[PDB]
RNA sequence: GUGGGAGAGGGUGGUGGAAUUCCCGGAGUAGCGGUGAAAUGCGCAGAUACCGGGAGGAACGCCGAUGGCGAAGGCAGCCACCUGGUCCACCCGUGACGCUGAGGCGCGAAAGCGUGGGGAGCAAACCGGAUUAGAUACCCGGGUAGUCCACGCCCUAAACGAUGCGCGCUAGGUCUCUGGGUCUCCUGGGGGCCGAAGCUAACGCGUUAAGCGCGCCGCCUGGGGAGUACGGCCGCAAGGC
C-alpha cells in the first residue's frame, strides 16, 4: 500500500525462464512474478506463454498498488521477451517506453564451455 | 546497404584529430555509444583509424559515452 | 632518442673531408653511437628482446665495416679504434 | 623539450576560492616541472556523457605547454594527488588532420 | 646522409569504462537455477530479479576487416617515456664493403617445474547429479593445481604457406594497405583473388612461382618395429636433442 501510480518494469528473459520485476521510478521493487510463481515448474517457464502469464500477474499485482503507467526495461535474449512486452502493452498498464539494457561485457571474463568459441 | 546518408558527406570541414570537439564526434556514434563502421561514416582506412583513437580519447575525458541504451524496441 | 644536432656533430667529427656523410669511419661512428644508446637502454628494460635483435644486427654491421677497413687501410682502422675506444 | 596538451577535469561544485586554489596548485606544479605554457582554454563546467565521481558535470581546463619529456609522467602523478582533480590526461601535440577538405 | 611516412613491433610506468564475483545498505517474496527431460545445488539465516555504494582480479566490446606489424613464436582500451625494424623521395656520400651459413650464441605459443606473491571468472584431478546395458565420457551442480604477476628453468607443436634464404629473368586484369608524383592515372613497397608462357602425377602454382636460372645451408632413400633401445649431451623434475 504505497500508491506509486507510475514506475518501471524490468524483464529478465533467459532461455530457461522469464521473470518480471515492477519497481518505482527509483528502481526499488514493489511486486514481481516469474514462470515459477505461476504453476509452471520445469522447462515450461522458458515459454513465451509462461512469460505472458508472468507479465500479466506482475501487472495485476501492481494494480493493487494503483499503478497506471510504466517504463519497460528489457534484459537478456530469451524466447518470451516480446511476448512479455506485448502482455504488458495491453494490460491496462500504459507502457511509456521500451528500452533494451542487456548487460554486454567489453570482453572481461571467460565464459563457461557452453558459451565458448568467443570472448 | 546504408543508403540513408554518409556522415562525411553530411558534414563539412573538420579536424579528425580534435578529441575535444564533441558535437561533431556525436555524429560518428550510433544510437548506442558504439563507433559506427566504415559503411556508415564513409571515411577512409586512415581517416577511420584516426577517428577511432580520437573517439576513445573523448570517451576517457568524459565527453563521449562508452555505451548507451536502445529506445523504442 | 638521437636528435639531428648530435648526428651532425658526430658526422662532422668523423668526416674524412668537408661534405663526407657516408665514409666507413662515419658509418662506424654512427653505429657505435646507436649501439651505446641501445646498450644503455638494455641495461634497464632487460626483458626487451626485440630491440636486442636490432643491437645484434648493428654490431654485426659495424664488425663487417671494421673488417673492410682492416683489409683496405689498417692505418685508418687503428685510428678509428683509437678514437672510439673499441675492441676492449 | 616537447610540446604537450594537458586536459584537467575537476570538481564543478567548487566555489571561486577553491577553484583558485586548485588552479594555483596546478600552476605551481607546472612551474616545479619546468612546463612553459603557450596558451590556455578554460572551458569550465560541461555536461559529461557518464557520471565521473558521482557527478554528471565536470569543470574542464586545457593547457598547451612545452616541457622536458623525462618528467611528463612524473608530472601527471603530481596532478592526481588533489581529490578535487578527478581527470588528468596528457597528450603529445599533433598537427591537425583535416577531413572532407 | 638528408627530408618525410605508416604500424596491436617491443619494454617500463600510469590510467579508463563495461561486465562477472563478493561485501554493505535499501526495497521486495517463494523460488531460482539448470536440461531433451530432469536431479544434485542454492533459497525463510530472505535467494533469484531491482536500485545505490564499496573491494578485488582478469580481459579490452564497438572501431575490426578478406586489415596492419614482426625473423619466427606472436602482438588489440588509453596516455607518457624508452626502443627495434621498415618504406618512400632527393641522387648527396663510401666504393664490392656482397650472398649463404656446418658449429656457437640468442629468442622461442601452450602446457609443465622452482621460489615468492596473487587468486574475480574459468577449470585437469577430484566431489556429486544425470544419462546409459555399464558411462572411469559427452550433459548438469561444485571444485584444486593451473590460468595471472616477478625472477629463474623447461626447447616441444598441425612452431603451417605442411613451400629455407638471397638475386636476376618471364603477359596481364582486379581488390586492398602505405608512400611519392605531371594525383583520369603513373611509379615504388606490402597484403589477396583470377589468369599468359611455362611447370606439376594430378589437385593446383603462376612477378608474393611450386616457371626459367645461379649460389649456399638443411633434410629424404619402402612400411611396421620406433622417435623405441643403447650411448652421449642438456634438464631440479617432467623430459628434450
Ligand atoms: K593478416
Ligand atoms: K599454492
Ligand atoms: K596519393
Ligand atoms: Mg527453466
Ligand atoms: Mg584525484
Ligand atoms: Mg605497440
Ligand atoms: Mg542483501
Ligand atoms: Mg547454484
Ligand atoms: Mg554454490
Ligand atoms: Mg534445501
Ligand atoms: Mg520466516
Ligand atoms: Mg547475484
Ligand atoms: Mg551493484
Ligand atoms: Mg579478494
Ligand atoms: Mg571483430
Ligand atoms: Mg608483414
Ligand atoms: Mg599463427
Ligand atoms: Mg652519386
Ligand atoms: Mg668517388
Ligand atoms: Mg643472414
Ligand atoms: Mg645456426
Ligand atoms: Mg617456450
Ligand atoms: Mg606458460
Ligand atoms: Mg608456477
Ligand atoms: Mg604458487
Ligand atoms: Mg565453474
Ligand atoms: Mg564442470
Ligand atoms: Mg560424474
Ligand atoms: Mg547404450
Ligand atoms: Mg539405473
Ligand atoms: Mg572459490
Ligand atoms: Mg604444484
Ligand atoms: Mg596454417
Ligand atoms: Mg615451415
Ligand atoms: Mg610430407
Ligand atoms: Mg617463397
Ligand atoms: Mg604488389
Ligand atoms: Mg590461380
Ligand atoms: Mg597452359
Ligand atoms: Mg586444370
Ligand atoms: Mg622465385
Ligand atoms: Mg623407418
Ligand atoms: Mg625397414
Ligand atoms: Mg615411426
Ligand atoms: Mg617425443
Ligand atoms: Mg623421448
Ligand atoms: Mg639414453
Ligand atoms: Mg643430471
Ligand atoms: Mg609423466
Ligand atoms: Mg608420462
Swiss-Prot record, chain A:
Residues 99-119 are annotated as: Disordered. GO terms for biological process: translation. InterPro entries: Ribosomal_uS11 (IPR001971), Ribosomal_uS11_bac-type (IPR019981), Ribosomal_uS11_CS (IPR018102), Ribosomal_uS11_sf (IPR036967). GO terms for molecular function: rRNA binding; structural constituent of ribosome. It comes from the Bacteria. PROSITE patterns: RIBOSOMAL_S11. The keyword Protein transport does not apply. GO terms for cellular component: ribonucleoprotein complex; ribosome. Residues 109-119 have a biased composition (Basic residues). Keywords: Ribonucleoprotein, Ribosomal protein, RNA-binding, rRNA-binding. Belongs to the universal ribosomal protein uS11 family. Part of the 30S ribosomal subunit. Interacts with proteins S7 and S18. Binds to the C-terminus of IF-3; however exactly how IF-3 interacts with the 30S subunit is unclear. May contact the C-terminus of Era. Located on the upper part of the platform of the 30S subunit, where it bridges several disparate RNA helices of the 16S rRNA. Forms part of the Shine-Dalgarno cleft in the 70S ribosome, where it interacts both with the Shine-Dalgarno helix and mRNA. HAMAP family: Ribosomal_uS11. This is Small ribosomal subunit protein uS11. It comes from Thermus thermophilus (strain ATCC 27634 / DSM 579 / HB8).
Curated annotation (Swiss-Prot), chain B:
It comes from the Bacteria. Transmembrane segments: none annotated. One of its GO terms (cellular component) is ribosome. One of its GO terms (biological process) is translation. Keywords: Ribonucleoprotein, Ribosomal protein, RNA-binding, rRNA-binding. One of its GO terms (molecular function) is structural constituent of ribosome. Part of the 30S ribosomal subunit. Forms a tight heterodimer with protein bS6, also interacts with protein uS11. Binds to the C-terminus of IF3 and to the central section of Era. Located on the back of the platform of the 30S subunit where it stabilizes the close packing of several RNA helices of the 16S rRNA. Forms part of the Shine-Dalgarno cleft in the 70S ribosome, where it probably interacts with the Shine-Dalgarno helix. Belongs to the bacterial ribosomal protein bS18 family. This is Small ribosomal subunit protein bS18. It comes from Thermus thermophilus (strain ATCC 27634 / DSM 579 / HB8). The chain holds residues 16 to 88 of 88 of the full protein.
Curated annotation (Swiss-Prot), chain C:
GO terms for biological process: translation. SUPFAM superfamilies: S15/NS1 RNA-binding domain. Belongs to the universal ribosomal protein uS15 family. Coiled coil: none annotated. It comes from the Bacteria. One of its GO terms (molecular function) is structural constituent of ribosome. The gene is rpsO. GO terms for cellular component: cytosolic small ribosomal subunit. Pfam families: Ribosomal_S15 (PF00312). This is Small ribosomal subunit protein uS15. One of the primary rRNA binding proteins, it binds directly to 16S rRNA where it helps nucleate assembly of the platform of the 30S subunit by binding and bridging several RNA helices of the 16S rRNA. Keywords: Ribonucleoprotein, Ribosomal protein, RNA-binding, rRNA-binding. Signal peptide: none annotated. CDD domains: Ribosomal_S15p_S13e. SMART domains: Ribosomal_S15. Part of the 30S ribosomal subunit. Forms a bridge to the 50S subunit in the 70S ribosome, contacting the 23S rRNA.
UniProtKB/Swiss-Prot annotation, chain D:
Coiled coil: none annotated. Gene3D superfamilies: 3.30.70.60. Keywords: Ribonucleoprotein, Ribosomal protein, RNA-binding, rRNA-binding. One of its GO terms (biological process) is translation. SUPFAM superfamilies: Ribosomal protein S6. One of its GO terms (cellular component) is ribonucleoprotein complex. GO terms for molecular function: small ribosomal subunit rRNA binding; structural constituent of ribosome. InterPro entries: Ribosomal_bS6 (IPR000529), Ribosomal_bS6_CS (IPR020815), Ribosomal_bS6_sf (IPR035980), Ribosomal_S6_plastid/chlpt (IPR020814), Transl_elong_EF1B/ribsomal_bS6 (IPR014717). The keyword Secreted does not apply. PROSITE patterns: RIBOSOMAL_S6 (PS01048). It comes from the Bacteria. Pfam families: Ribosomal_S6. Transmembrane segments: none annotated. Belongs to the bacterial ribosomal protein bS6 family. Located on the outer edge of the platform on the body of the 30S subunit. Part of the 30S ribosomal subunit. Forms a tight heterodimer with protein bS18. May make transient contacts with protein uL2 of the 50S subunit during translation. HAMAP family: Ribosomal_bS6. This is Small ribosomal subunit protein bS6. It comes from Thermus thermophilus (strain ATCC 27634 / DSM 579 / HB8). The gene is rpsF.
Amino acid at each position: 500500500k504505497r500508491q506509486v501510480a507510475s514506475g518501471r518494469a524490468y524483464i529478465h528473459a533467459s532461455y530457461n525462464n522469464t521473470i518480471v520485476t515492477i519497481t518505482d521510478p527509483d528502481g526499488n521493487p514493489i511486486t514481481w512474478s516469474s514462470g515459477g510463481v505461476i504453476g509452471y515448474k520445469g522447462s515450461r517457464k522458458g515459454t513465451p506463454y509462461a512469460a505472458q502469464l508472468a507479465a500479466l500477474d506482475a501487472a495485476k499485482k501492481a494494480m493493487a498498488y494503483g499503478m497506471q503507467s510504466v517504463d519497460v526495461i528489457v534484459r537478456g535474449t530469451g524466447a518470451g521477451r516480446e511476448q512479455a512486452i506485448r502482455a504488458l502493452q495491453a494490460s491496462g498498464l500504459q507502457v511509456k517506453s521500451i528500452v533494451d539494457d542487456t548487460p554486454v561485457p567489453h570482453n572481461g571474463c571467460r565464459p563457461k564451455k557452453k558459451f565458448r568459441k568467443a570472448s | 546497404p546504408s543508403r540513408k546518408a554518409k556522415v562525411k558527406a553530411t558534414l563539412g570541414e573538420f579536424d579528425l584529430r580534435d578529441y575535444r570537439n564533441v558535437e561533431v564526434l556525436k555524429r560518428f556514434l550510433s544510437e548506442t555509444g558504439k563507433i559506427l563502421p566504415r559503411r556508415r561514416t564513409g571515411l577512409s582506412a586512415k581517416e577511420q583509424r584516426i577517428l577511432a583513437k580520437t573517439i576513445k580519447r573523448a570517451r576517457i575525458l568524459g565527453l563521449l559515452p562508452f555505451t548507451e541504451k536502445l529506445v523504442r524496441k | 632518442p638521437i636528435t639531428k644536432e648530435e648526428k651532425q656533430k658526430v658526422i662532422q667529427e668523423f668526416a674524412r673531408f668537408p661534405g663526407d656523410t657516408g665514409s666507413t669511419e662515419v658509418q662506424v661512428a654512427l653505429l657505435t653511437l646507436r649501439i651505446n644508446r641501445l646498450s644503455e637502454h638494455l641495461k634497464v628494460h632487460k626483458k626487451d628482446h626485440h630491440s636486442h635483435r636490432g643491437l645484434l644486427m648493428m654490431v654485426g654491421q659495424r664488425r663487417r665495416l671494421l673488417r673492410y677497413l682492416q683489409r683496405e687501410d689498417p692505418e685508418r682502422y687503428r685510428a678509428l679504434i683509437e678514437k672510439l675506444g673499441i675492441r676492449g | 623539450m616537447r610540446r604537450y596538451e594537458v586536459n584537467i577535469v575537476l570538481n564543478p561544485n567548487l566555489d571561486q576560492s577553491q577553484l583558485a586554489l586548485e588552479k594555483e596548485i596546478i600552476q605551481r606544479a607546472l612551474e616545479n616541472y619546468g612546463a612553459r605554457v603557450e596558451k590556455v582554454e578554460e572551458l569550465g563546467l560541461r555536461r559529461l556523457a557518464y557520471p565521473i565521481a558521482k557527478d554528471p558535470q565536470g569543470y574542464f581546463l586545457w593547457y598547451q605547454v612545452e616541457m622536458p619529456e623525462d618528467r611528463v609522467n612524473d608530472l601527471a602523478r603530481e596532478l592526481r594527488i588533489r581529490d578535487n582533480v578527478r581527470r588528468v590526461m596528457v597528450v603529445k601535440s599533433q598537427e591537425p588532420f583535416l577531413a572532407n577538405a
